[PDB]
Point group: D2
Chain length 302, copies 4
């Protein structure tokens, strides 16, 4: 019931930095994690490449090179190998390209890999942020709705070694429903990655609130569902776009218990007691005692 | 589209203090609000009496004296008369007793009164915190489940002068569902009152997080639905129980724009621009664009 | 002993925008203040012009036109006349040019004007941020050390109507010495303006902390000296440079009691009770009971 | 220059819990620390016994029994032996009793012990909080001024293995002067321990800000001097008095990087890069470039 959770924040991944170069950066973090008694580490969203949805692509082949067609392929394999021989689980985000009867499905995906190196769960991003068309005035695009489709796995919770773990991806953390669906399935840890620019072209009047909104989302989510949470950023200046840092780990009371302070590759860690979830879920947010779903119907109407 | 919103926090209300004496304290806060240009003021939950759910009543007549059988009665009419003279809307919380079909219904209620002095809408607390039977191992009782039954009006949003306003009551502001049903109805302002002790007998290890949790709830709710909000506390040491202060007014971005600093009757105000809601709702939380209600059905299961 | 204090935040002042146009904006904030019961309003640093220290100047006369030689001149007079007509006091920031003994002295200055329109006191910025020579790596210079010389008035505290008021200017708020010198002179209100860019050329890894460090400074300084404080930003996108919003009013406990949420001209207000300073200064920070100046001599060495 | 720093918070220490028992608890935290790669661990103020200044003592022998006459004694020795075996330095707080020509001196002290087990520095509390004579209404007393005299070593900074470290004890963290004296001496880490009740009898209206004021002091102190910091609480319900938790580690930007979330013995850790102090100290708070001590003379008047 007690474990050490970590977050492996990434600094920038350049457009032509290789997957072999990224994996090497991930392995060094696993190594750092293992010297600090870590048992599970969270890596960022789209952790194997630069954040490619910042450009408008005119070439499908070029677009497809940023997606994984297997997991892991030969180059990502050492990550898996290293993490199991260290006996450390991990959450990895990546772009997923699958071919169904000749039709190409694209997803922004994350997976949970237990301490033995078994993939025990997958999640695909349901809330895809940004815009649809190329928008000339932006200094950088945000075309996730063009490069991915909404996930089709719902928000699942999985058994990973001792814990019940749910996943979120980036913008999903901002929606109370993401958290609540996994809270209703008894997640003890909700975790995921993000790439969050500190400039937003259509509403630049919120730019100086980027960290505030990120942390607000993580603290409320955890508190409302009594779940430990963790958010691992890919951060700093990547291809000219400044990505938010403040990767974090948060208690079931919404307290931030660990926080990064660099914009580089950085491992933060926190001791997690999975029975601490009880302080909320057996008390103020004891859902059978207090929740009232018969009056929340509008939320699930579509 | 622009208004000055206030919160009229109350300091304690002794069990012996009369409704006439309380009403005189509410009047003095409307005079203050008038002096600062206020157009609408939010008063606390159960604002006419001490917080009677802290005791276990055996005398049903004694329990009934804390309820209102009409709104306003004679004792509460001067509040209505003076607010309608000054042109100020208000939100008032009070304990309501209504007989229907052979049942004496008891509800923890709030109403919205417009600047003409008309009662435009009611809400009756849906999430009742605490417990139903006397519990000897707690130092003070929290018998809201025994003295009230959950509201039967859903979470409605009403036009009040120029604004779409929704109400919550106390513990409701902790549940993201509360805010999201009203957000989906296009509430611009969401407001209500509270009595929140700073000591929680069953989980006293969260007592120094009382203010944190209260503010976290208001900030995240406002942010997620792009709504201004306001919470009016009844605060300080009331009958030997300390109630949290930190009454507040919050912008649509989650920023706290006004906060009380005393534990006495105290008026705080803020400038509200109802078009600021679009900064979130036509953008990051543009629901038609990004919300995914098709994957949230677990939230509404009962 | 009780008043309503206001902050008058300015959005951007263009390079071609006139002193007459900038005074009409100030005047509109004064009347918005008067409708909300305000007795004193704080305006930003260098409130009459754009923030000219972002540029390297070659033509002295060109530089000199940004400075005041009189306070007020014919164009700034109506601000003083209207403020005294409404009976509101104000803090105004502006660039001052004084020729004395063959030396052209340039100061970044602020004045207190009481409700009757009397200039009661001046302060000249002591801590000038930035650099003294043009530096090539910045999109905007920060030449305060070239365009100004450090103030020669110390950190004075003045009587202004009922209150003991001290002034700071911009970066001064970051030094605990600023606040403490005024606290040791009894200041009850410490106030001043700022122009703070949300990008810091030499340590851009702290840009997402801009609001955090501005508010941290204001809360700590207030708390430590048991003083109300107020900071008025000149904010938003100015001449290509984005300046931080979050103008604020803070209580003697360090609580933020009012905060701006727009990057445009905006008035915020708060009730101030000059006797609340005692909660801190007769108790935890009772300087005669607890301060130990015998061990602080290194702070004053030079 | 890189290290793993920790805080060993303590849960309650009963009046008759023996030093052997406390030492045993300390040893358990050192094991935990070692498993997380820690190099240095900070323990609380007065970490060997219950917080004995809460009571009125009338017997000298009774008071004396809570003081160390040697450091370490036999019972405390195994803390030093294990720490040194593990290669972990530590900061320990304890009550010091020394007899100088028949006169008893009493200090509330803390020592820095390097990874070899050598005591390399001591500090004695300079700002003793609380009242000087018994005050009947208080539920618990705060008689530090009676049981200790103010320290006589000023605020020293010492070399501890790779690092420059300064100490503070409890209420000392609230005075900007504590932090500034050690920042002016180059401290890279400023650390120390505390016992902070969440109820304050004379000003109970700040009790819901107890965590707020603690963290604010820590964040502000660190940010202004460019130092990593750490505060180690002895927390929870000790002899009927609830002590604040929220032990923390803080970066030189004032960001909290590690926070405790229980009110029991707990170890938190953070990676520290002693070269990070430069982000502030070479730039915004470049003392040589920016500070003006010539106008800070009132701070040192006495
Ligand atoms: Xe929700
Ligand atoms: Xe200071």
């Amino acid at each position: 019931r007690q474990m050490i959770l970590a977050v492996g924040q990434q600094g920038p991944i350049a457009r032509a930095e290789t997957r072999e170069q990224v994996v090497g950066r991930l392995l060094d973090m696993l190594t750092n994690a293992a010297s600090r008694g870590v048992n599970f580490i969270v890596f960022p969203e789209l952790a194997l490449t630069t954040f490619f949805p910042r450009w408008h692509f005119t070439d499908e082949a070029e677009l497809d090179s940023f997606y994984e067609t297997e997991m892991p392929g030969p180059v990502v394999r050492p990550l898996f190998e290293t993490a199991a021989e260290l006996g450390i689980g991990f959450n990895l985000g990546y772009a997923e390209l699958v071919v169904e009867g000749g039709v190409k499905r694209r997803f922004n995906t994350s997976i949970l890999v237990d301490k033995s190196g078994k993939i025990v769960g997958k999640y695909r991003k349901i809330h895809l942020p940004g815009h649809k068309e190329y928008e000339a005035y932006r200094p950088f695009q945000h075309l996730e709705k063009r490069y991915f489709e909404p996930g089709d796995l719902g928000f699942p919770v999985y058994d990973v070694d001792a814990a019940k773990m749910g996943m979120f991806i980036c913008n999903d953390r901002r929606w109370p429903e993401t958290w609540r669906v996994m809270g209703l399935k008894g997640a003890e840890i909700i975790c995921g990655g993000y790439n969050t620019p500190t400039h937003n072209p259509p509403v630049p009047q919120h730019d100086h609130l980027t960290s505030f909104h990120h942390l607000l989302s993580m603290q409320a989510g955890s508190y409302q569902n009594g779940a430990w949470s963790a958010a691992a950023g890919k951060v700093g200046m990547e291809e000219g776009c400044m990505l938010l840092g403040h990767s974090c780990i948060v208690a079931p009371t919404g307290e931030i218990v660990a926080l990064t302070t660099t914009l580089e590759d950085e491992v933060i860690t926190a001791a997690l007691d999975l029975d601490r979830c009880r302080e909320l879920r057996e008390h103020i947010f004891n859902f059978k005692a207090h929740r009232q779903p018969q009056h929340y119907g509008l939320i699930a109407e579509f």
